[PDB]
Design a protein around this ligand. Sequence first.
Ligand SMILES: Nc1ncnc2c1ncn2[C@@H]1O[C@H](COP(=O)(O)OP(=O)(O)OP(=O)(O)O)[C@@H](O)[C@H]1O
Ligand SMILES: Nc1ncnc2c1ncn2[C@@H]1O[C@H](COP(=O)(O)OP(=O)(O)O)[C@@H](O)[C@H]1O
Ligand SMILES: [Mg+2]
Lengths: 463, 463, 48, 489, 129, 129
Amino acid sequence: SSGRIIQIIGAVIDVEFERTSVPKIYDALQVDGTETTLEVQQQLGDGVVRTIAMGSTEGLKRGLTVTSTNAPISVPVGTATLGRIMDVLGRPIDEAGPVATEERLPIHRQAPSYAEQAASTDLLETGIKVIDLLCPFAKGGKVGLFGGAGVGKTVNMMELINNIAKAHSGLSVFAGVGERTREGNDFYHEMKDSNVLDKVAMVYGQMNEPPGNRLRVALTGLTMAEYFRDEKDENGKGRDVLLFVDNIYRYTLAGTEVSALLGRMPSAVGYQPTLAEEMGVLQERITSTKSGSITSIQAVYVPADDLTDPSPATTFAHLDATVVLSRDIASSGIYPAIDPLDSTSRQLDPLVVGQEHYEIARAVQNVLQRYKELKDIIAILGMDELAEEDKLVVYRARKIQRFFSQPFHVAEVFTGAPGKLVPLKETIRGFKGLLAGEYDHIPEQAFYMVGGIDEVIAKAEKL
Amino acid sequence: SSGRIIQIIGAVIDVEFERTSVPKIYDALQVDGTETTLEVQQQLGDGVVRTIAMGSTEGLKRGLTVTSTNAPISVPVGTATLGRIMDVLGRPIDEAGPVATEERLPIHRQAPSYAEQAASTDLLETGIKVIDLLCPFAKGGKVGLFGGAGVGKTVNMMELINNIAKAHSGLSVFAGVGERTREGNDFYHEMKDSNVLDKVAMVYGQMNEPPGNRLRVALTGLTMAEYFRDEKDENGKGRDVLLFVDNIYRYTLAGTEVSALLGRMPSAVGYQPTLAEEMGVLQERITSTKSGSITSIQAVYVPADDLTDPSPATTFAHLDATVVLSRDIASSGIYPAIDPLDSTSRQLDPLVVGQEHYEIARAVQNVLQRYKELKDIIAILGMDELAEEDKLVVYRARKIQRFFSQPFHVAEVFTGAPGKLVPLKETIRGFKGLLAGEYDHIPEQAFYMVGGIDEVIAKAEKL
Amino acid sequence: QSARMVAMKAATDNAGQLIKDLQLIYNKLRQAAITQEISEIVGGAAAV
Amino acid sequence: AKNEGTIVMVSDGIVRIHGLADAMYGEMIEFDGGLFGMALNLEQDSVGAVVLGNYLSLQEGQKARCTGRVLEVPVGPELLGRVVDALGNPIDGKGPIDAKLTDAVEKVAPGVIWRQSVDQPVQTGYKSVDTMIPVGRGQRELIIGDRQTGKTAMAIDAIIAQKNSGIKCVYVAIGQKQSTIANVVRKLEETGAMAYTTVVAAAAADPAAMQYLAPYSGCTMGEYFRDRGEDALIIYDDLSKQAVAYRQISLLLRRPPGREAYPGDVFYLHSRLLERASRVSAEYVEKFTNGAVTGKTGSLTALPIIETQAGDVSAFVPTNVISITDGQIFLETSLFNAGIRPAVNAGISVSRVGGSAQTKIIKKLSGGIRTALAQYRELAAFAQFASDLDEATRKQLEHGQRVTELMKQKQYAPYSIADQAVSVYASNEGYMADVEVKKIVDFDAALIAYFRSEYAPLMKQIDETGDYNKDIEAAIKAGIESFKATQTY
Amino acid sequence: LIIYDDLSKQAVAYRQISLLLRRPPGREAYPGDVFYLHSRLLERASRVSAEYVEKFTNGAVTGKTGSLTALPIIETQAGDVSAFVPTNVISITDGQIFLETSLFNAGIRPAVNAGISVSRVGGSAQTKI
Amino acid sequence: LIIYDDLSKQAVAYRQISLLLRRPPGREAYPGDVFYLHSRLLERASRVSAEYVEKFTNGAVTGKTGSLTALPIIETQAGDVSAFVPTNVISITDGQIFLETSLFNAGIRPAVNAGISVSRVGGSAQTKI
Ligand SMILES: Nc1ncnc2c1ncn2[C@@H]1O[C@H](COP(=O)(O)OP(=O)(O)OP(=O)(O)O)[C@@H](O)[C@H]1O
Ligand SMILES: Nc1ncnc2c1ncn2[C@@H]1O[C@H](COP(=O)(O)OP(=O)(O)O)[C@@H](O)[C@H]1O
Ligand SMILES: [Mg+2]
């Protein structure tokens, strides 16, 4: 009932077992006398199976004995994983001791059936009023963060992590393989000192690790997020969850790596893979079931001219929302640095969100477009050359672009105020009032970093 | 002897005969207990022959028995095939009873020799303004139509059938065609009304048939037309025979589909390595030998709307007159959408069509080519920044471009206007008058779908 | 007349520069194009 | 021994089976655990099969045996207002389906001698389609466009518009998220269009085979009414996903790759499906029903959907499928973002049936207006460089602008036959020659409302009877004239 | 003097034979030894010296020099002279005569393009006048 | 402080080895695995903490922190940073130094284009002055 390795090429390890017992697909095998463990991708007949190595691959030679656990790779899930960092197999690495959780879940599971889907399309309300009006999210949707290396892209992640737990009482999971740029403090340190560590679970992997570990990282997270969503309160309602499966690498792999989040490999395993079944199944597991929702946020790195419509559309096809980070906006002292014109969403539809919100939107974007077209003329000369009904447009555009600013709770260490969580209705009211021209007499800079319009009025009154 | 099937894949079936009974190439085999028959394609040795099924594959299993006819697929030919519709193997599908003939001919035969070859001497008049001027036809010649989907190949072919093939002395026409079953059935009923059916033979094969049927359909029409070409009564020596083929591409597609399964490496743009020879063995049989005359019109499909594809590029060398249809002109509203340029005929010679015709054609082509090169300058420079002669050339080229359009008798359903038929001398006189500089005041609008010049003069009053 | 000169001159200059960049793009595509077919053809060699 | 065998390889949904000497092509095979599969290639020593269901429960050595029957699907009038998967098993949890008849999934189309020319119209509710690209009962049109251009909206509008026509509808979804399918079903039930519609779902979670046999089962379900002297209609939401699934399932079966990866018989795959949508003659109906119904003709209309990559109408599948259908409805992203909500490109979109599939009033009023727009496009593109323009060019440009801005419509707002007739008559007669370029939608909306409020019997007669007479034409002209004055916009 | 009407069709036939014989494929599926095919053919058009003719005929002919001139013909698709076979054969010959499609339609009947047509032998192959 | 003279030549050598090992070429100029080749190498440059030093040295060294700085060099063809290999390396580095050839020829000897080059860590690295 024990197997022997017969072939080791790249990530693939063909193992051979007797006729009576052959491990089924997705079973976990343990190699005696070595840390490495293997997963059964496919059967080839004559009691021969093909496997990918997960555990560390050192001192692996042909002819070693392998035993079978007759079960899929299981990961610990619970409330005791909050604030801990673990590897793909769920073993802790932060030297903080073991995990008190005693319950495990398999990482391979079928997607929810057609009868378990949501009755209606609801929206996820976050604390950032730029997102909630220009590119609203959807429970169960998919979001893509497009931006360069100039913006850390991490402050927004921390703010979302804090806001979901503060408002909707939702925990979050973060799964990543490698760090593209290390200029900021490492994420674990950035959370530890921002006091958001208690609300998040982390899974990490290194490039210099068996290729099997680099794959299957998203599966380990999705399982944790699924356990977090289904668990119910005394009322019996579930919880919403955000999965920050950051894009592991650039489109060189991303094209076949962003697909790893859906079940395709970035040329990691040369020999026959079996991820076509994994496609769709890994993509149809991020949905809003009747009890709860799991919304996925995926970053992406674009050098230039490879985002949104001109992008290769390998990743842009399935994304329900895209948030674009502009270097120029960041260099103009505006935070968060999210450009309203380039950012788009599929939820900006009168049927799904309402005619009031839709008509409130697409009116500010018109002002932005008019100001962008008049910028050169404004650059050529000031309001003195400008005629009537365009100076008002310029002033309103400046007011709204300054009003897009908002304090963050994650920056409470450097902020006297504890940050703001502006409700969506308040943002709609403020933007409608400002578009009506009533707030034109309000002096400028009162919309800057004053968060909600109501706070802006008080700031205008005091100075 | 009797062979047994050992392997079937799609439409390709291999059969293992005994050592001494191996059938030769292209021999027809009958499958006992079923209506399906097979044709040989290769001799893979060891008594095994690869074959393609001539029919549908239903309820076929390994180990079935097959009997060898030791002859190619034979079809009935004679005068009793007139007024009937038949499948590829020569069976009636008109529900009118069996064909009462005992003369049969093999489908596969060799092309005529160099010694028996003829020379075209008489012109053919069709009534199309553009065809009669820039691309004269010849009795016993070859004509080809080149266009992408939805440009007007079928409408032009039906108009040509109506104009010349409707009523002539004993033309004994033949129509091997396939395409859409809606356009078929409409045709059989349309002719049955005119009574032309008693002097036409139709071989028809649907486009949903297995690749075996679509590969050999044309070789049946050629076989039936050759008999009409060669037969002679009391020194009558037959009569001019007309052939119309609309399925040439489907032949290449079936060849491409079966080439990979037969075990042959790919060539060029996913094409079979033997494209040129397969086209040649077919197009060298459609000819007028000294014993009789065949006038043939073919429809050629251009994939992706580019003429440099290996399929339409190989065909140019096998035709005497080529008419190229352009998508831009079709989208411009002009029909028939024929490109004055890139349309040539071997009979366009001063010693064949005379002296006035040659000069008129050359002048028209020169004017159009000169106008073609002026579009970039007008795009960059203003229209006023051109020489007066260039402006005259542009205006006359526009008038001439509209002047090639006339309404057809067949396309009345699309528009409602009655058809027209213009004699050659009227076209010559009108074009001579136009190039001279008269007709300049007349607006270019009055030249659309207006038959002969006098109708242009009459229409000038209205619009 | 003088003004036309300058305007026309600018156009010529621009055109020249334009050509250069197009050439670069063309070359890229050319090379890229070739590579693709080779891969596909190699695939056919493994199709048996 | 001739009917039972063992599995020797499981990988990505493909199963290789030893034994099974007496096995047919396309025959059904049963696995232990209630899983069914079909045989697609029979090599010298092995049988390749695809699994219809979850293959993760299959292991090497498990037995299998041949049923002896071809794949069949339940069919009947009891499947109306129901959602099923590719095998017809209900998934909406409303109870079992009381199936009375089972029909084969793969079958051949009727012969050429048994068909008949199409001469009856199918109304979609779009002005730009009912006038320029007519659709008739038995004609297979095609919807072709880039992603997020409005392909699904038109099919749903076409399904909704058949509330009173009495023709059944079938919707097939391939490779789509479950949320979108649920939203589509909710919208269908909200408008009451579910009373005569069946839904077949093959989502992304379902195996490749389920995404490959869905259109065939849908067409088999839709052929029940065609064979019995009634009219049906079927919409495939995306055939490109079917092509991808077929490519994957063929590549896993060890079949040689072709251009753009797709192996051979892709054109055969897409043609043996679309050739089954046709109008059949009466005599075939009496022969099939054995005289139960007489003097009746059936039909089956198909509206497949194909998506292109960055406006590529030159790839393998986009060119292969265009040459099969009877027309194309082409959609631009450039026109969608410009503001033209029904972004239909005239000139490149054609209908081969023509005027034979229209009512008399629509046929005679809308005579050759597509050509006018096709000529106008080029004329406007060229006249920008012209220094001066003759009167004839200005009139044509103004008429083209008015016609282009007239054929804009809002989603979920079908127009009746009378409304289209009134709009087309007003356009052709040139009553809006003085109306400003803007505020055109307001004008015709108010005109349609006014003729709906008054002259009611005339509109009812027009809707029930598609007829145009001197007395039918005179009232429409007088009403427009009456509306021209004594009214506000 | 010898004239080959189309070497492109010979190349196509050679490619077909090689592909049917399973020789390894290359750009446009052409086999490896395709430049050599035209190289060994076009290099036989030469002018031998009087000594070669004297030796070959064993003194039958004295004081006479032979020659052989070749005029191969090549067709290009859409003017793509950068294709594999046109580039292969251009580098072998001693000159090129280019015929344009636009000049043919414009009325220049011989349609010879002067500016990209060159002869390497030059004026050494002309009479005095 | 380690300086790799040219990682592009390393990419070429890896491509040669992979192609000689009969691996499929793919639709790109270089195999995809090249990406990992330039990541596993570039990950190993980091600054460890004082606790790691003491743990590794078993208490022989205390109150000190290690370091390792890398300066890879990549060569571009005609100033194309959008090519397969240059795009990969830019995405996994903390800063870039752009040397233009136009500035080099036009008098400027150290041709450091400050418009595009960036360090992404300012002030913390520099001294107080
Ligand atoms: N006629 C119309 N008027 C206004 N809005 C429209 C119209 N048609 C479509 N839309 C809108 O445009 C968007 C297109 O959505 P739709 O589902 O029709 O696209 P699609 O082409 O099917 O996309 P996908 O590729 O995701 O299937 C939707 O927001 C829809 O509401
Ligand atoms: N003379 C004409 N008048 C009006 N419409 C035409 C004319 N010729 C072609 N067309 C249009 O062009 C289309 C071409 O269809 P058809 O010829 O059947 O397909 P194909 O061009 O692929 O053979 C037809 O739908 C028809 O509407
Ligand atoms: Mg859609």
